[PDB]
PDB file of C-alpha atoms in Angstrom:
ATOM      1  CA  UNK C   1      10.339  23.779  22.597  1.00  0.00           C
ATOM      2  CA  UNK C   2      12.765  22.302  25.093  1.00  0.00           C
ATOM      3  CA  UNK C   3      12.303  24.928  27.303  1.00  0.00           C
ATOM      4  CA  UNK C   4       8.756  24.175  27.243  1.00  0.00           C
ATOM      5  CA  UNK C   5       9.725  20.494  28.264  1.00  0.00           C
ATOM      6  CA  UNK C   6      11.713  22.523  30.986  1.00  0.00           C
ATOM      7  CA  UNK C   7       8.627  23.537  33.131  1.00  0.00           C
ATOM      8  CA  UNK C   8       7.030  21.387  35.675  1.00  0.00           C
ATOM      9  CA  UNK C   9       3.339  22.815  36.342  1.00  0.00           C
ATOM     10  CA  UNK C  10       1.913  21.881  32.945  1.00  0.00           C
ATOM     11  CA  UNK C  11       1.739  18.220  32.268  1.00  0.00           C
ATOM     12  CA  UNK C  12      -0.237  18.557  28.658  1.00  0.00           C
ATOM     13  CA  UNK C  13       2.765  21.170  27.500  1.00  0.00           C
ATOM     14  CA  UNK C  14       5.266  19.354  28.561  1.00  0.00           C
ATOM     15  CA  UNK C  15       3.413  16.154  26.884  1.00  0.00           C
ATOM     16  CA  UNK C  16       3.012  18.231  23.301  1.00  0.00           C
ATOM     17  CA  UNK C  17       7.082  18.807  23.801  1.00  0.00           C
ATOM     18  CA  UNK C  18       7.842  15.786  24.248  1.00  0.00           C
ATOM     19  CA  UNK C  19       5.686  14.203  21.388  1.00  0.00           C
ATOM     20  CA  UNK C  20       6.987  16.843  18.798  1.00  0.00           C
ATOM     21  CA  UNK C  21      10.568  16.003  19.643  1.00  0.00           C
ATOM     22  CA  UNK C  22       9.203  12.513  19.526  1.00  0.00           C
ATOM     23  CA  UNK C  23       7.722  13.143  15.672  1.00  0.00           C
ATOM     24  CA  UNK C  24      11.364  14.984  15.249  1.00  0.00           C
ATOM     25  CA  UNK C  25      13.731  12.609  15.834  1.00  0.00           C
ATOM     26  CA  UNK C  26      11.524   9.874  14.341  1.00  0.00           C
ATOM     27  CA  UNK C  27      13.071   9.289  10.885  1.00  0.00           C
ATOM     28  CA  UNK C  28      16.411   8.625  11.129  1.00  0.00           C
ATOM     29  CA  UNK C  29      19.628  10.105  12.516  1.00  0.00           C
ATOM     30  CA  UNK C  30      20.641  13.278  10.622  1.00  0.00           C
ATOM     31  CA  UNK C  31      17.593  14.890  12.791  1.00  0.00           C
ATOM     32  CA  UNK C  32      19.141  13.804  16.255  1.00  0.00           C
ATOM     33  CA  UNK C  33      22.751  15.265  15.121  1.00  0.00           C
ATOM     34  CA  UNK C  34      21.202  18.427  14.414  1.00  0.00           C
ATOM     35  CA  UNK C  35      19.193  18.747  17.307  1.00  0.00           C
ATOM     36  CA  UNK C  36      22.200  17.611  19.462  1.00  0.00           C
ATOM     37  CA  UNK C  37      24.165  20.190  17.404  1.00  0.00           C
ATOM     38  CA  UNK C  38      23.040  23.314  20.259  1.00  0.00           C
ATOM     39  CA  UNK C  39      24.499  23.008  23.445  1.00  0.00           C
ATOM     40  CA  UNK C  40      21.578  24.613  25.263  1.00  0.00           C
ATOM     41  CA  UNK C  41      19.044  22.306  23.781  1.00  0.00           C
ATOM     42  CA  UNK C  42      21.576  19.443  25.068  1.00  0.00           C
ATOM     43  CA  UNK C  43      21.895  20.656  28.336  1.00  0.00           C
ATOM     44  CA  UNK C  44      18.071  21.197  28.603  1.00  0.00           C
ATOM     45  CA  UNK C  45      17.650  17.373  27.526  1.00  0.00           C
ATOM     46  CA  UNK C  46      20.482  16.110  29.754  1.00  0.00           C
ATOM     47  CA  UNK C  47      18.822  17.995  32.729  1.00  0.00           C
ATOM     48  CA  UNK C  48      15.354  17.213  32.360  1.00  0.00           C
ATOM     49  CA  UNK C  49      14.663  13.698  31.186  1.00  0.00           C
ATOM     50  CA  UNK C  50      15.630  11.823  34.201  1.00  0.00           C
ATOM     51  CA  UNK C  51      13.566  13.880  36.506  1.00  0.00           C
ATOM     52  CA  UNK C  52      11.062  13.255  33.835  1.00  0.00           C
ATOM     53  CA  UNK C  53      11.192   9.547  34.784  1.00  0.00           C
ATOM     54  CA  UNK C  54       9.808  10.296  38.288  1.00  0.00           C
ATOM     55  CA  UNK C  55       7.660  12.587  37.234  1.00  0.00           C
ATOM     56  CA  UNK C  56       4.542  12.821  39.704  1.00  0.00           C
ATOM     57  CA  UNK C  57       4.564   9.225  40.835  1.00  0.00           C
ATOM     58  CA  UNK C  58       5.508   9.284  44.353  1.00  0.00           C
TER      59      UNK C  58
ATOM     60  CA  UNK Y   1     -36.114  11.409  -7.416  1.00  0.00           C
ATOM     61  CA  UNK Y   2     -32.978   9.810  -8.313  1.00  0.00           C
ATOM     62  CA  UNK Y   3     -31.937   9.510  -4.532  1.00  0.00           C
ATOM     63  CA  UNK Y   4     -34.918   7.990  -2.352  1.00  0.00           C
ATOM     64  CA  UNK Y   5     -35.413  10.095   0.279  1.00  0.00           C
ATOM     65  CA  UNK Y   6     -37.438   9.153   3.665  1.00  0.00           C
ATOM     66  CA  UNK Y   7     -39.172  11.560   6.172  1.00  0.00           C
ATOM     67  CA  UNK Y   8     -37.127  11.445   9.920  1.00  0.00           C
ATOM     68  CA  UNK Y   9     -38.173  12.819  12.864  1.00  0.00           C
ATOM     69  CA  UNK Y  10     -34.877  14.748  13.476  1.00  0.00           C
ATOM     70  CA  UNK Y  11     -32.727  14.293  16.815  1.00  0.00           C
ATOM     71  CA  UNK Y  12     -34.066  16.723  20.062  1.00  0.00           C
ATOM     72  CA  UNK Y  13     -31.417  20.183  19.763  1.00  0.00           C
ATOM     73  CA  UNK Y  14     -30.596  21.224  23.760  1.00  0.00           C
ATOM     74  CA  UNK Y  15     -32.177  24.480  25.070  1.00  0.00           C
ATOM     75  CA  UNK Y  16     -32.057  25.984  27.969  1.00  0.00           C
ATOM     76  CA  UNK Y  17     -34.154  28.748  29.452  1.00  0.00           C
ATOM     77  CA  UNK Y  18     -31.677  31.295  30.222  1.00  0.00           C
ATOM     78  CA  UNK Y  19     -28.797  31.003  28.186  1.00  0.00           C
ATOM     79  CA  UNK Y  20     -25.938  32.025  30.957  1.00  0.00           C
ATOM     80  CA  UNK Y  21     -23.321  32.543  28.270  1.00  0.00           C
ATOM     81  CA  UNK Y  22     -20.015  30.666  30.710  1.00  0.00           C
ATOM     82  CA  UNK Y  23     -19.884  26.904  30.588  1.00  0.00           C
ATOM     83  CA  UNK Y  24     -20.512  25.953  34.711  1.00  0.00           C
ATOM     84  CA  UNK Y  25     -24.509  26.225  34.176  1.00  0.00           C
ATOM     85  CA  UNK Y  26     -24.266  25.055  30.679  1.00  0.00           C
ATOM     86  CA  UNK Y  27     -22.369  21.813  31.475  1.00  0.00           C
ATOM     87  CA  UNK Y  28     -24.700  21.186  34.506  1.00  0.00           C
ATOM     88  CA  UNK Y  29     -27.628  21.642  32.674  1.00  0.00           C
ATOM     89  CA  UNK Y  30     -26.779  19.766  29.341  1.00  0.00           C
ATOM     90  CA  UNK Y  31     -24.983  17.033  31.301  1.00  0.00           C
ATOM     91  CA  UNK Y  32     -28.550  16.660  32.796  1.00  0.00           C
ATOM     92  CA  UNK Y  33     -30.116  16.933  29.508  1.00  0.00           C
ATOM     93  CA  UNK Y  34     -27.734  14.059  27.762  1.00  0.00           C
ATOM     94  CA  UNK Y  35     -28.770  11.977  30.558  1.00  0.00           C
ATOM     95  CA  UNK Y  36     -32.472  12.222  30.232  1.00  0.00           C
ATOM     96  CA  UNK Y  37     -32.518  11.926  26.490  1.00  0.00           C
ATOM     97  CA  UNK Y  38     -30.065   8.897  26.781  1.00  0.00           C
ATOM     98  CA  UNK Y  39     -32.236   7.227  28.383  1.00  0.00           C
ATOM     99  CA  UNK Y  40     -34.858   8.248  26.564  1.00  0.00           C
ATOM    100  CA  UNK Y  41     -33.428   6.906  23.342  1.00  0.00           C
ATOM    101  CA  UNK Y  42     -32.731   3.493  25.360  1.00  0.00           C
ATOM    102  CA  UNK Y  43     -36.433   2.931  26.130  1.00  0.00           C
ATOM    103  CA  UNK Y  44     -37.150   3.875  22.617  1.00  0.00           C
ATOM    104  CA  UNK Y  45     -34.719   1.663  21.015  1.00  0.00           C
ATOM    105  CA  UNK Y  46     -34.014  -1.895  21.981  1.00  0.00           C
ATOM    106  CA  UNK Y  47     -30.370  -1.289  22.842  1.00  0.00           C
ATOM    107  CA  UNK Y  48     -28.296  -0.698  25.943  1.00  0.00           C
ATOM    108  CA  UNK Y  49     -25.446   2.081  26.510  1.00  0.00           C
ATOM    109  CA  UNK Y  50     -22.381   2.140  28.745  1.00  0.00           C
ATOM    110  CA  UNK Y  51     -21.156   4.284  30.894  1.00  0.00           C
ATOM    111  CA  UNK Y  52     -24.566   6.138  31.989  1.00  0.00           C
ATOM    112  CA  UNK Y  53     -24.506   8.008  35.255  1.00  0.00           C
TER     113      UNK Y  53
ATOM    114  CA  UNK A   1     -36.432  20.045  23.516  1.00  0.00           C
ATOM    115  CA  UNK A   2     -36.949  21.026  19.872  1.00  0.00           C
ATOM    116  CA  UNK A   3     -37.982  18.420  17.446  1.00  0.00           C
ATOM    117  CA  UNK A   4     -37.443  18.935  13.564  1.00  0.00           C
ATOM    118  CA  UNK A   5     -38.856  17.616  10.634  1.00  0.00           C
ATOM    119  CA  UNK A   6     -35.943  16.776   8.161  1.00  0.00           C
ATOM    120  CA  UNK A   7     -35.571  14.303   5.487  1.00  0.00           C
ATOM    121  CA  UNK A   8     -32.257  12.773   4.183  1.00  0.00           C
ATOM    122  CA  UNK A   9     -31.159   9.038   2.702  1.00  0.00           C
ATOM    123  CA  UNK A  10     -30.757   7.302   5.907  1.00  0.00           C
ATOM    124  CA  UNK A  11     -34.078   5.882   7.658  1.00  0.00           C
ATOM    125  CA  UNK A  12     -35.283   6.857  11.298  1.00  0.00           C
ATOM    126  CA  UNK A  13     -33.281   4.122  13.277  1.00  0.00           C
ATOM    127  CA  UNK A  14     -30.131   4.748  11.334  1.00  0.00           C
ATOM    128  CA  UNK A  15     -30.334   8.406  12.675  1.00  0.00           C
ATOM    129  CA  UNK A  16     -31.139   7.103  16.531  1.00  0.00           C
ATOM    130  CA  UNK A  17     -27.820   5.131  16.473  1.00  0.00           C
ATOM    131  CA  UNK A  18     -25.930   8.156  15.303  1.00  0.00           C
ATOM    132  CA  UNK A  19     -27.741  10.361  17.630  1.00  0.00           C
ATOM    133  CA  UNK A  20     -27.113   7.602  20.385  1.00  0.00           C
ATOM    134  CA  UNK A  21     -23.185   7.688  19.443  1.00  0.00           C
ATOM    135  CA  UNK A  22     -22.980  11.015  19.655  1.00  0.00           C
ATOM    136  CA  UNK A  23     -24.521  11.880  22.798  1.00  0.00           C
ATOM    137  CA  UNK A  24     -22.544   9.197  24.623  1.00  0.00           C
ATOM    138  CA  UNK A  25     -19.112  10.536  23.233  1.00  0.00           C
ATOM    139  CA  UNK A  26     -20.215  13.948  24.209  1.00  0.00           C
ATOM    140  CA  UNK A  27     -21.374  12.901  28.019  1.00  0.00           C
ATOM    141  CA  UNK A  28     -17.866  10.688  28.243  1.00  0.00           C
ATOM    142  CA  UNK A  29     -16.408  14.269  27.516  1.00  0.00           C
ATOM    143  CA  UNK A  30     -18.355  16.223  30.081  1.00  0.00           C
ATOM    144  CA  UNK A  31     -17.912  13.398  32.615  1.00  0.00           C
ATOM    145  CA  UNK A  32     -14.168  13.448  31.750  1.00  0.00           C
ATOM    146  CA  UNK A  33     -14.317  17.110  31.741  1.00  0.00           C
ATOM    147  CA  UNK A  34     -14.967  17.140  35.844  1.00  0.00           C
TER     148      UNK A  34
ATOM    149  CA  UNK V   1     -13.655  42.473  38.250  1.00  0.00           C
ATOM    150  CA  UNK V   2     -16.507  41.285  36.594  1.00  0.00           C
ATOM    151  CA  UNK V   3     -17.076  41.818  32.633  1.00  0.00           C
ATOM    152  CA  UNK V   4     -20.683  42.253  31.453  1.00  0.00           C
ATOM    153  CA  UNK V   5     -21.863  43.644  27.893  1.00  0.00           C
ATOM    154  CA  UNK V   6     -23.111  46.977  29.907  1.00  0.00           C
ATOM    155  CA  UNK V   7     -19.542  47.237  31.537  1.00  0.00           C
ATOM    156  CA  UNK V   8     -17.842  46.572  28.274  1.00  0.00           C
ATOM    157  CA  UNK V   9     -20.083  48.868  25.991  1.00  0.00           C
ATOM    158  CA  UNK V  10     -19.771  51.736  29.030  1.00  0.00           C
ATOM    159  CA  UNK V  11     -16.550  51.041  28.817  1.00  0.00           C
ATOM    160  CA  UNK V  12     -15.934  51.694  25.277  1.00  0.00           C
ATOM    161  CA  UNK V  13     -18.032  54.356  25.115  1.00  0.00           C
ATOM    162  CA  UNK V  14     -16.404  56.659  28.110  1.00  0.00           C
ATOM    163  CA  UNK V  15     -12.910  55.790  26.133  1.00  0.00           C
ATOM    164  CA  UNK V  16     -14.222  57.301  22.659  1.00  0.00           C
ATOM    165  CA  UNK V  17     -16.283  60.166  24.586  1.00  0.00           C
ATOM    166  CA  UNK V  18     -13.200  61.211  26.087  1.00  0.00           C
ATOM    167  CA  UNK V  19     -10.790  60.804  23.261  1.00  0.00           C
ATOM    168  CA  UNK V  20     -13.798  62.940  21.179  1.00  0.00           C
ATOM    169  CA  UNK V  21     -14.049  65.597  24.076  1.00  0.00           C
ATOM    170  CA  UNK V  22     -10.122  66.152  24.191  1.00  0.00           C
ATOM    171  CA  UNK V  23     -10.034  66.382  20.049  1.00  0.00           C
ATOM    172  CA  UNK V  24     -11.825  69.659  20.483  1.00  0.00           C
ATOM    173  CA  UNK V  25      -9.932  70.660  24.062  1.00  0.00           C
ATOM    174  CA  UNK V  26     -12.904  70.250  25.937  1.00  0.00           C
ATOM    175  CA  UNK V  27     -10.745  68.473  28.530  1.00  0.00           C
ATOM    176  CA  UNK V  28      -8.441  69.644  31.201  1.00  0.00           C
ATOM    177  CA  UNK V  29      -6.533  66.050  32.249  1.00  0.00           C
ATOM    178  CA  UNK V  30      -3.413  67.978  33.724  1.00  0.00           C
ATOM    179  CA  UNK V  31      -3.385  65.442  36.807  1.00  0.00           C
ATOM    180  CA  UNK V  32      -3.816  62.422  35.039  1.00  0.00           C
ATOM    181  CA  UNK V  33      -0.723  63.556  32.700  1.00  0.00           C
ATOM    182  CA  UNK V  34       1.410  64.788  35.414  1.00  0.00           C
ATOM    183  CA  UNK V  35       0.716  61.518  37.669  1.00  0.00           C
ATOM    184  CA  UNK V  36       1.491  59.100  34.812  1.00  0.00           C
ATOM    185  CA  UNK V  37       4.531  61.111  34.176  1.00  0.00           C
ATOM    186  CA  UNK V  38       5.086  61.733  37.566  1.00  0.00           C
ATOM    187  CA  UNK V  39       8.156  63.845  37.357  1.00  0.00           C
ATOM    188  CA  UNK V  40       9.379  63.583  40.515  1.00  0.00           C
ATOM    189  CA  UNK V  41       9.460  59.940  39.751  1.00  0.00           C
ATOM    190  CA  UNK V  42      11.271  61.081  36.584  1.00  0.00           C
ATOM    191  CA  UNK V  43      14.369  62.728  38.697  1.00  0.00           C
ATOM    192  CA  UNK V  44      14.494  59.746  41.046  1.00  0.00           C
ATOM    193  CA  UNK V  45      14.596  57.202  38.467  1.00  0.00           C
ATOM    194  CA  UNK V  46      17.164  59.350  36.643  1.00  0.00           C
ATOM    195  CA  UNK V  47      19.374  59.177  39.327  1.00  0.00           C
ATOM    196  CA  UNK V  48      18.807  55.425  40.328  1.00  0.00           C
ATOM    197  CA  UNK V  49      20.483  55.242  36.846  1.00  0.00           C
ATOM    198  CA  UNK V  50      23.377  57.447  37.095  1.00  0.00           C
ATOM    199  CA  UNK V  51      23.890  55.590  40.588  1.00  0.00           C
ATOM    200  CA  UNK V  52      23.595  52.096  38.495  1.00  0.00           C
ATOM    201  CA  UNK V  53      25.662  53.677  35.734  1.00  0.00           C
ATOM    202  CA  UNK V  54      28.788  54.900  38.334  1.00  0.00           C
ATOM    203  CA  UNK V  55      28.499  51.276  40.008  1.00  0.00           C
ATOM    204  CA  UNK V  56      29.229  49.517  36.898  1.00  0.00           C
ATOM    205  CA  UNK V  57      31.623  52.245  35.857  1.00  0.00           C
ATOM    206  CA  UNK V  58      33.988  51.535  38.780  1.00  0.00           C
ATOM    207  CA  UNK V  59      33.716  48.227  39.449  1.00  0.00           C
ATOM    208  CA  UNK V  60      36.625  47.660  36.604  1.00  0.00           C
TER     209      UNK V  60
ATOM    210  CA  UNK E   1     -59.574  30.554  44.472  1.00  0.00           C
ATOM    211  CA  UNK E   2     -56.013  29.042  45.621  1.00  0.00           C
ATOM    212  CA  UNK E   3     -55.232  32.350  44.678  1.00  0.00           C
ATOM    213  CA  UNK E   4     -53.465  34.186  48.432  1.00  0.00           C
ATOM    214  CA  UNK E   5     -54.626  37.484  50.158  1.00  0.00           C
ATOM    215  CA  UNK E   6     -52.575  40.477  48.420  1.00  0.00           C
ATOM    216  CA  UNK E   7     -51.315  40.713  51.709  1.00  0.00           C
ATOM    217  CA  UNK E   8     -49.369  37.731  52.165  1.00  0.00           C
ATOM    218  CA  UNK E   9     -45.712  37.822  52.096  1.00  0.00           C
ATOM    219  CA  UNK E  10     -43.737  37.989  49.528  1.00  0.00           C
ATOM    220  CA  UNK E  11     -44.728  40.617  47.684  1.00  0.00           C
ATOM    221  CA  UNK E  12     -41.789  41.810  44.962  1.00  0.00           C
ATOM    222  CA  UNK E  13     -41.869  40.760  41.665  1.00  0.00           C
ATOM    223  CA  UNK E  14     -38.244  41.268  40.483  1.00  0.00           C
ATOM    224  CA  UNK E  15     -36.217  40.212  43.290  1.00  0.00           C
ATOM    225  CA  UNK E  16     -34.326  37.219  41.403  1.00  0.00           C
ATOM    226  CA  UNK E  17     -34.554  38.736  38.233  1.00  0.00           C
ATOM    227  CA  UNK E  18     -31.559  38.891  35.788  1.00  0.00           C
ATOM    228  CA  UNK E  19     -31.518  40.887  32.509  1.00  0.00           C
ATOM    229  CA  UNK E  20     -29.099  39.327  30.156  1.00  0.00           C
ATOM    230  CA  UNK E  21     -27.447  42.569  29.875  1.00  0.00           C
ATOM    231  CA  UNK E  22     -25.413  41.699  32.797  1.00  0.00           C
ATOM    232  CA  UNK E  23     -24.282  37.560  32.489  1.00  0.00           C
ATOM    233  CA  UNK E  24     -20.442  37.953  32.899  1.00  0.00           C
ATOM    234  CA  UNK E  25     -19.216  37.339  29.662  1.00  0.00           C
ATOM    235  CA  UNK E  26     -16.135  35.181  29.227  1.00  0.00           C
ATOM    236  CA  UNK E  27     -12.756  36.708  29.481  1.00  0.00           C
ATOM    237  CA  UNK E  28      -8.615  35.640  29.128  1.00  0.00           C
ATOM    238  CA  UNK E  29      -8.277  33.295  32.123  1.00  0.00           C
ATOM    239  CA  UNK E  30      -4.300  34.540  32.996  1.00  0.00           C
ATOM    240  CA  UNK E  31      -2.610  31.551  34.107  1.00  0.00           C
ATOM    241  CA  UNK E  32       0.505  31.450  36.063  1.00  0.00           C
ATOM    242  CA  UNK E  33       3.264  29.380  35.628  1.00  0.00           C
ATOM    243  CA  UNK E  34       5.501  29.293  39.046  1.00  0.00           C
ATOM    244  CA  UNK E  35       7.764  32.641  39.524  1.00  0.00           C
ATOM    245  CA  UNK E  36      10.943  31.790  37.531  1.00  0.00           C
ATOM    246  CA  UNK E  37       8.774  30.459  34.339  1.00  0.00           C
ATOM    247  CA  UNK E  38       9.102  33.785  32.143  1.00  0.00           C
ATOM    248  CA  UNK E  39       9.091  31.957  28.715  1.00  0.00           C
ATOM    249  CA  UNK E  40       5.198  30.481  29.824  1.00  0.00           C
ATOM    250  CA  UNK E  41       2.102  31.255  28.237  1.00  0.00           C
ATOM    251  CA  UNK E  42       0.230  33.329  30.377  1.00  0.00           C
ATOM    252  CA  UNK E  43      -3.202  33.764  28.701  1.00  0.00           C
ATOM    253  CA  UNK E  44      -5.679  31.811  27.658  1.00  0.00           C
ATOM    254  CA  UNK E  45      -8.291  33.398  25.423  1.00  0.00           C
ATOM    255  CA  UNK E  46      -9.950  30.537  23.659  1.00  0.00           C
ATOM    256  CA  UNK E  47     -13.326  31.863  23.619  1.00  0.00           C
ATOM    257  CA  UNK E  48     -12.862  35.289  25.068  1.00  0.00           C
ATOM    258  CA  UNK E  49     -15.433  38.416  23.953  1.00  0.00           C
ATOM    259  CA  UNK E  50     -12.679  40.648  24.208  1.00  0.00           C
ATOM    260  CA  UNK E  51      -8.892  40.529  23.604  1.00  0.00           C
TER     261      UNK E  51
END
């Protein structure tokens, strides 16, 4: 699923990413530890949410 | 009858001539249809709608 | 168009508003569609 | 490139015909079998891999 | 009559006409996602006829 939020040519997959992790991470803070837990899902995150900020806005 | 029941003239189903089978004429065609019957149902009814085009 | 005779509980101009809701949501989704 | 119920039905058809006509060896498809197979392109790619195999083996 | 001379141009009867046995039936629509996006969907068969 973070790989999906790794692409940039699809807006509504990247959206449906984004709003699972959203739904994930929701209650509380056992979820975030174990989704932090992988390194590559990290490293995915750490890469792509910034350039999610300025994403298609000129 | 325990549940009163009333005779209504149901709601006009969309048919086309040739039925094309991909959705370019369909949309075209039914877009035209839901206009026409929308306003239709406006001069019928003493409403007003939004967003008609 | 195809008209059909139908009964049910509701009364004629109960059934236009429905018909009227519906067919608007569906052109806002065509329109949005394009 | 386009798809139309007679394309698809011919389609299916000519597959089944032909699967029918080889059950009873009615068929001679020697050219289609040897150009899928292509055994020339069978000793070429054989030795692309022993080439790929000594690279790797002597690069340690 | 308003009816023309048998004459007059045109004078085919099925030169616009389209049997339904040939209407291009919908297919997969094979998307493509850049050239490095492997893990991508690459279909899209929704409402496809066939497979």
């Amino acid at each position: 699923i973070v790989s999906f939020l790794l692409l940039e040519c699809d807006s509504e997959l990247i959206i449906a990413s984004l709003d699972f992790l959203y739904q994930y991470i929701l209650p509380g803070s056992q979820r975030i530890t174990e989704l932090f837990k992988s390194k590559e899902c990290s490293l995915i995150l750490e890469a792509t949410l910034p350039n999610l900020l300025s994403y298609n806005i000129a | 009858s325990s549940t009163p029941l009333n005779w209504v003239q149901g709601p006009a189903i969309f048919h086309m001539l040739t039925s094309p089978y991909t959705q370019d004429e369909i949309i075209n065609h039914e877009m035209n249809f839901l206009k026409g019957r929308l306003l239709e149902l406006q001069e019928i009814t003493g409403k007003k709608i939004t967003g008609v085009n | 168009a195809v008209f059909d005779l139908m009964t049910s509980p509701f009364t004629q101009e109960e059934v236009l508003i429905k018909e009227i809701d519906f067919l608007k949501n569906k052109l806002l989704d065509l329109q949005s569609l394009q | 490139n386009n798809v139309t119920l007679k394309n698809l039905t011919a389609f299916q058809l000519l597959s089944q015909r032909e699967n029918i006509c080889e059950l009873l060896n009615l068929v001679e498809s020697t050219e289609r079998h040897n150009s899928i197979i292509n055994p020339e392109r069978q000793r070429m790619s054989l030795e692309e891999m022993k080439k790929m195999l000594d690279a790797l083996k002597n690069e340690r | 009559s308003n009816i023309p001379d048998p004459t007059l141009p045109p004078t085919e009867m099925m030169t616009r006409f389209l049997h339904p046995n040939w209407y291009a039936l919908p297919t997969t629509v094979w998307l493509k996602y850049g050239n490095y996006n492997s893990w991508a969907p690459s279909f899209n068969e929704n409402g496809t006829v066939v497979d």
